Subunit: 49 residues, 2 copies
């Protein structure tokens, strides 16, 4: 039988671990350098004669 093979690995390096920063809905807001607000928005108008 072909069985599922698993290699021996080293303990986790702290430097590898990022998921602590985006596991929750509010964190994916924390992670943004700027959040979208209403006064950011400019709407084009085409004016006819």
């Amino acid at each position: 039988m072909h069985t599922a093979e698993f290699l021996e690995t080293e303990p986790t390096e702290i430097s590898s671990v990022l998921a602590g920063g985006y596991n929750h809905p509010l964190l994916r807001q924390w992670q943004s350098e700027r959040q979208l607000t209403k006064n950011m928005l400019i709407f084009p108008l085409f004016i006819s004669d």
Copy 2:
């Protein structure tokens, strides 16, 4: 009489002129690198036994 003296000056250098960027209420919002939103806020709670 002491009169108000005015020195002769050079034409305006464009490099001097910044006020074009914050003359209007919405521009002082434009000028901010991040705007304050509600999900930014963390409120401390002191829990008694």
